[PDB]
DNA sequence: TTTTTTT
């Protein structure tokens, strides 16, 4: 619901007030009601109440209530003779707790502002607005260094926002914080106008014995300062500041750890319970990296996923085959540990692959899976301080797929048992550090003749898995040959690109995971498929 | 002065006791490289006793404290002390100390403050706690102790963390020092008070106007620049760099620094001088077999390894790799099918030790490849500073080398560089471990190879669905790769059995592994070298005792039928025709090999087989042809 | 300079041979090369056998039976282990090499092709 | 030529020693000090006496001396080459050794006999040592 | 630190 809204740092000080109140105005009606007719004529924007919601209880004085208190709010918020300020708002909370509301009040933005022009005589320095900075947006950014040793930034993106498609509720990387530039020229500078009327109200008091030479030297002082804002130098020197004071310890070692959550196009996707939720409100997960695809719930009924289940069941005419390549499938959306398997398949012609294993890489997108060549699995090694690139393609994905076959390829076992086992894997990101991670990712490799297996042992035959097509797509040429269908090309050249289509197919690999979790315990060797066994 | 002042503050009982005084006598021998606060000391804590006479005595005593201990007791643990004695007194002293210098600064340069005179007072009040060296690329590098109550990353606490910026030094200026600069305008203004006398409070409103225009300085970014990059020359310690990860008996870990100096080993958790950068994820617990986990543990590595003496001695070896000093030049063969779990110990090992004190070594190091030692080559660095490397990789039935073999299994200095280093030198202190899925091929038979080579043949397999009636085959488990391996408590306790272990070998024997007694792995290991003996295969096969035989064989007719036979039967591999004629030459050979009038080696007799059969009937042929009773952890001390 | 890593009787090119031993352009090392089997010389040339001189040992040290002949004897491994990381071995070592260097210069003019050693000779 | 006392002129008979302030660009130069040349030096008279021991002959004698004079000029020269071959310890690799050493490192180099016995490639490959021979006259 | 060029 965002009570607090990160764009309005106000209503975090309005609510800080509304804890102070007396619990006297929990669950009551009569002067919960005054105080909020005396927030709407301070400012009726649907915050003071929300934070009554939020701080007391809601609705406990009477349930269903809510709608007379909205109707009161809109008759406080049109035309009202009475009009309390928020100055009584001050005074109940001073009548509750002097002490309290004093403690409550030292740690505003306005009250560190004020302290520091006061204290320092109307100069205000790079830390000083840093400070302020950090206590009104300190919920928005956060900075770390990564591992070739620079300051990062980092955003959480709001729905209302000059972003990115696919970027919402989630951490956008900075290098520098545009935003921040622009609050502290549009946003600060409204806080600094109410500091310099704070000293006006304080100039028209009595000139009492010498204190208005004081204040008027005050206010010239602190409108010398009020100009150096929108300067680029001060304004780069507070930036600089405030990476001090915005600085999570491990906030890029956290960044992408968890594999139940998912960034996705409308939100975060969260498969740690069945079924799986959708998160599109504020939340504390850090999550950086996404699909284009937003998550809709899976349902038959929608005309793009008939239709590709119809393709799927065009693609895979065994029942049990269909069933285990779904499933096996439907765990590129894990990124964790997962067990030793690689699947084969094998096509004469114009058969399904390119069509099902792209489908997967682009409804995953380009941070969570990856084409892979094929020199990684035949050619042999190279040595290990070279910077291998092209290995370093499955660091943080949950899929893979190779695609080219020379002429009867023989792979490397050696490369077989690194690239699927569930253990660490060592290799160097080029002009970098040699580094070990994580195998995470779900094989599939589709080839035209076949694969030459060298070795007989146990080793490398309990992680492999073959599959033959025995549908062939001629459209013109379709014959009465049950096996043979006519094609079409769409299925390759507008299908495979349209939202719709993905978002669809990306339904249906999540409602085949968790199939896959309810039905067994995740654990794909109980996936009993005698087609795919014999295959093999 | 200050210095004098926490010595004062030191408890009678300093004295009292012969090695906490010597503790002291050698931290302030390492503050001053003198005896004069050290003679103050003296006279502090105990004008009495000795009196005058024996000073000459305390002399050589400093000395010999001097040069002992081998690890550098300074100004911080006397601080520490002071402050553990006596907190509010240590509050105060130092309290003024600094406030005491900023106001000299302050006084004698009218209230105009630069950057080395906060940098002075910064040092003087955050000196315990940073530290700054010049690393091999020549930039300044920061260096901060890690306090309990502090926005810390997992296992940082206790030991020292590389900072690309002095953050917290950066925020300590406009906050803490802040407030030591309000103090001093709190006493500017008590000065104004005073009666003006002549024109002193006009002094001190012009040092006051002064000192409040250059106070805004303490927030501006770029004077914190400069007063940060003066105090590089003041935090900076010479040997800190080099020194910092050297000591093999202290391990970082996830709740401090273990220290196995001295049975039983000690979890430091409080203030110490060690320099400790690098660490491990893992907890220390001390061993107790009670724990689910660590009985979990135990009962796979009972059911892995069924004979007690070679279990006891591959967890003696394996408890080696905790120790990164300099260890017997040994190296462990492990042979099976892949269907036993010695694969499952290896990842186990690494996992408990981490990144920076185990690594993953491919046997391409091994087997066919050159070192370079000229380019960058950062796949050597992995094995710098790490006691455990583990080989995890057997394509199909890999020749090893001899040269690399003992290259990098004999403890010397080996070199190499790096990205953006130059060509360094370092010492080999990894315990190895070797898995063969095939087999391994020695091709050499030298005394000082074989002496360093250990084998041990996997006995028990693992299948999923099946498990028949065999004793040596039993059920895997889905979880023992895919979640026990993951989880924090399996790898606390298999720590704790690590260091268990190698507190039993230190115990029962001197830390040597050879003294430790299996006769399971010195038969495997004869038998092993017995089976990778080529000659007296080839000498057995086809070289047959024909009685009255006038068949000439020099010793290339030899090498040329060795040469056929090894190729044939060994992998096809190049051999040096005087090499080979040398090593017929040691052997039965001898017996029937004599000289030729020529002067040329000749095998009297003795046909050659040639072929399959054909060999000599007459005169045959040439070539002759416990248990654990309750605990298995434990055993006996003095077999 | 040393070379003590030998894999299987390495074989040695006279080109190396003719470089790095002349003083031509600055080598300034005093070269040692240890081998376990053998070294393959492929000339005959004078100006490069006159730079070679040849040893061959005659000491095994042997651990565990250690017989009676006068040519083998009991050794301890400290010698490679704890003896050559000691830095009093290391200092008394230096003040050896110091010692004999003064030798040199004392009882010949700093030549070694003064000094007489038939064995050595023989062997080459 | 940049010599270790000034500048060495041999633009006219005799070759002149530039001590004095010119105009002329010299950067580079040879550690070697010039004195004119004297018979009766003893240094002169040990190597002219060397020279007339390595090559009995008169007239080669002259020829080789003659040849090698012109390593100390650094202009287009006939395109010559000399081979001197003999059997074992004779006067080569001192007299050779001897005009580089006089000539220094900007004006002489060493250069390796794989430039010339074989393993001449496509030109992709640097081949790492042509410009040894870049602006020295030996 | 790469490109290279190792080859
Ligand atoms: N379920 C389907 N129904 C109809 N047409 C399809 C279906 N799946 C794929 N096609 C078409 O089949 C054609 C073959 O393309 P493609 O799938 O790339 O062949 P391929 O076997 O994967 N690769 P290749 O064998 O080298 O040509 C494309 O034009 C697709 O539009
Ligand atoms: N003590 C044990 N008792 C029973 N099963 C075990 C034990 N240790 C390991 N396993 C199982 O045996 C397997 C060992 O892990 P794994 O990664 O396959 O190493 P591996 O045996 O060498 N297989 P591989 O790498 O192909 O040679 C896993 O399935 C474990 O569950
Ligand atoms: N004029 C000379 N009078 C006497 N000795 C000389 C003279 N010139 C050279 N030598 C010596 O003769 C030896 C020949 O060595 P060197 O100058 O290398 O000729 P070389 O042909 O290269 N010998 P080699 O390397 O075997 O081919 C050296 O010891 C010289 O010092």
Not at chain 2, 228 to 245: C, G, K, P, V
Not at chain 2, 502 to 524: A, D, H, M, R
């Amino acid at each position: 619901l965002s009570i607090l809204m990160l764009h309005d740092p106000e209503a975090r000080y309005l609510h800080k007030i509304l804890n102070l109140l007396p619990p006297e105005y929990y669950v009551e009606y009569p002067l919960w009601s005054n105080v909020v007719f005396a927030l709407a004529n301070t400012s009726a924007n649907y915050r003071p109440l929300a934070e009554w919601f939020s701080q007391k209880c809601p609705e406990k004085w009477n349930t269903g209530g809510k709608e007379k208190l909205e109707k009161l709010w809109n008759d406080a918020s049109h035309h009202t003779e009475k009009k309390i300020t928020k100055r009584s708002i001050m005074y109940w909370a001073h009548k509750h707790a002097p002490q309290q509301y004093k403690e409550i009040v030292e740690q505003g933005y306005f009250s560190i502002l004020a302290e520091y022009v006061y204290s320092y005589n109307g100069m205000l320095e790079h830390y000083m607005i840093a400070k302020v900075i950090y206590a009104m947006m300190g919920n928005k950014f956060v900075v770390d260094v990564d591992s070739n040793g620079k300051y990062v930034w980092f955003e959480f993106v709001l729905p209302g926002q000059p972003m990115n498609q696919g970027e919402i509720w989630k951490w956008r990387k900075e290098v520098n914080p545009d935003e921040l530039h622009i609050y502290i020229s549009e946003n600060f500078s409204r806080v600094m106008d109410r500091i310099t009327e704070h000293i006006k109200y304080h100039l028209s008091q009595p000139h009492e014995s010498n204190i208005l030479n004081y204040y008027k030297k005050l206010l010239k002082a602190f409108e010398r300062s009020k100009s150096k804002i929108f300067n680029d130098s001060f304004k780069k020197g507070v930036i600089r500041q405030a990476e001090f004071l915005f600085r999570q310890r491990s906030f890029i070692q956290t960044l992408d750890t968890n594999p139940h959550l998912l960034g996705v196009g409308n939100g975060v996707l969260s498969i740690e319970t069945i079924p799986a939720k959708l998160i599109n409100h504020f939340h504390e997960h850090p999550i950086h990296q996404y699909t284009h695809i937003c998550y809709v719930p899976f349902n038959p009924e929608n005309p793009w996923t008939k239709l590709l289940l119809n393709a799927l069941q065009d693609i895979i005419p065994e029942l049990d085959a269909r069933l285990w390549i779904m499933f096996y499938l439907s765990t590129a959306i894990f990124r964790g540990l997962k067990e030793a398997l690689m699947l084969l398949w094998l096509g004469g012609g114009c058969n399904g692959k390119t069509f099902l294993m792209r489908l997967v890489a682009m409804v995953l997108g380009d941070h969570y899976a990856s084409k892979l060549n094929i020199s990684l699995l035949t050619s042999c090694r190279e040595t290990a301080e070279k910077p291998n690139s092209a290995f370093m393609r499955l660091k943080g994905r949950g899929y893979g797929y190779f695609e080219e076959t020379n002429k009867s390829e023989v792979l490397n076992t050696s490369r077989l048992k690194e690239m699927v086992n569930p253990g660490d894997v060592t290799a160097r990101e080029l002009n970098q550090k040699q580094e070990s991670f994580q195998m995470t990712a779900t094989m599939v490799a589709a080839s035209n003749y076949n694969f030459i297996i060298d070795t007989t042992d146990h080793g490398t035959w309990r992680r492999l898995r073959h599959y033959r097509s025995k549908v062939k797509f001629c459209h013109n040429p379709d014959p009465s040959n049950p096996y043979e269908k006519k094609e079409d090309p769409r299925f390759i050249h507008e299908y495979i690109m349209d939202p719709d289509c993905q978002n669809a197919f990306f339904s249906i690999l999540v409602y085949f995971w968790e199939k896959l979790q309810k039905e067994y315990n995740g654990q794909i060797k109980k996936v009993f498929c005698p087609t795919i066994e014999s295959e093999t | 002065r200050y210095l004098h002042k926490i010595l004062n503050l030191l408890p009678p009982e300093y004295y009292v006791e012969y090695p906490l005084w010597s503790n002291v006598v050698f931290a302030l021998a390492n503050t001053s490289a003198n005896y004069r606060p050290l003679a103050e000391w003296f006279s502090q804590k105990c004008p009495e006793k000795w009196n005058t006479g024996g000073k000459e005595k305390l002399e050589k005593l400093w000395n010999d404290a001097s040069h002992h201990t081998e690890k550098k007791i300074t100004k911080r643990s006397i601080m520490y002390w002071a402050h553990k004695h006596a907190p509010q007194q240590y509050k105060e002293i130092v309290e003024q100390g600094y406030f005491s210098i900023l106001a000299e600064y302050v006084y004698s340069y009218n209230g105009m403050l630069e950057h080395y005179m906060i940098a002075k007072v910064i040092y003087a009040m955050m000196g315990n706690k940073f530290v700054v060296d010049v690393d091999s690329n020549g930039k300044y590098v920061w260096f901060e102790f890690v306090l309990p109550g502090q926005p810390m990353n997992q296992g940082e606490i206790w030991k020292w963390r590389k900072e690309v910026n002095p953050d917290e030094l950066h925020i300590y200026i406009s906050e803490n020092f802040s407030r030591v600069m309000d103090r001093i305008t709190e006493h500017i203004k008590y000065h104004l008070s005073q009666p003006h006398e002549s024109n002193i409070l006009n002094y001190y409103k012009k040092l006051l106007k002064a000192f409040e225009r250059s106070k805004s300085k303490i927030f501006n970014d770029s004077f914190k620049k400069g007063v940060i990059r003066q105090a590089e020359f003041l935090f900076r310690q010479r040997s800190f760099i080099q020194t910092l990860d050297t000591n093999p008996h202290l391990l970082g870990v996830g709740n401090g620094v273990l220290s196995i100096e001295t049975i039983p080993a000690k979890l430091i958790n409080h203030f110490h001088e060690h320099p400790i950068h690098q660490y491990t994820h893992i907890c220390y617990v001390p061993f107790n077999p009670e724990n689910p986990w660590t009985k979990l543990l135990l009962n796979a590595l009972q059911d892995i390894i069924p004979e007690l003496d070679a279990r006891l001695w591959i967890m003696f070896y394996l408890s080696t790799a905790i120790f990164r000093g300099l260890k017997e030049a040994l190296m462990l063969l492990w042979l099976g099918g892949g269907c036993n779990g010695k694969t499952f110990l290896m990842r186990l090992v690494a996992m408990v030790l981490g990144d920076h004190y185990a690594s993953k070594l491919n046997i391409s190091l091994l087997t066919s490849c050159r070192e370079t030692a000229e380019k960058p080559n950062s796949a050597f660095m992995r094995l710098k500073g790490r006691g455990y490397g583990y080989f995890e990789e057997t394509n199909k039935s890999e020749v090893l080398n001899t040269s690399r073999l003992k290259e990098m299994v004999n403890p010397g200095d080996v070199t190499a560089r790096e990205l953006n280093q130059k060509q360094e030198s370092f010492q080999m202190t990894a315990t190895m471990v070797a898995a063969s899925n095939y087999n391994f091929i020695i091709d050499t038979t030298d005394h000082g190879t074989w002496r360093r080579l250990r084998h041990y043949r996997s006995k028990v397999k693992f299948c999923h669905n099946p498990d028949p009636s065999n004793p040596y085959e039993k059920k895997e488990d889905p979880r023992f790769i895919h979640e026990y391996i993951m989880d924090p408590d399996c790898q606390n306790a298999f720590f704790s059995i690590l260091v268990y272990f190698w507190e039993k070998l230190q115990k029962e024997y001197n830390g040597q592994i050879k003294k430790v007694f299996c006769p399971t792995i010195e038969s495997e290991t004869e038998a092993y070298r017995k089976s990778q003996d080529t000659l007296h295969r080839f000498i057995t096969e086809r070289v047959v005792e024909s009685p009255s035989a006038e068949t000439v064989y020099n010793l290339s007719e030899v090498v040329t039928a060795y040469a056929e036979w090894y190729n044939t039967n060994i992998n096809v591999k190049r051999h040096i025709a005087l090499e080979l004629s040398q090593e017929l030459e040691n052997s039965v050979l001898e017996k029937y090999l004599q000289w030729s009038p020529n002067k040329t080696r000749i095998l009297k007799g003795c046909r050659i087989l040639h072929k399959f059969e054909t060999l000599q009937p007459g005169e045959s042929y040439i070539g002759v042809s416990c248990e654990p009773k309750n605990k298995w952890w434990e055993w006996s001390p003095n077999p």
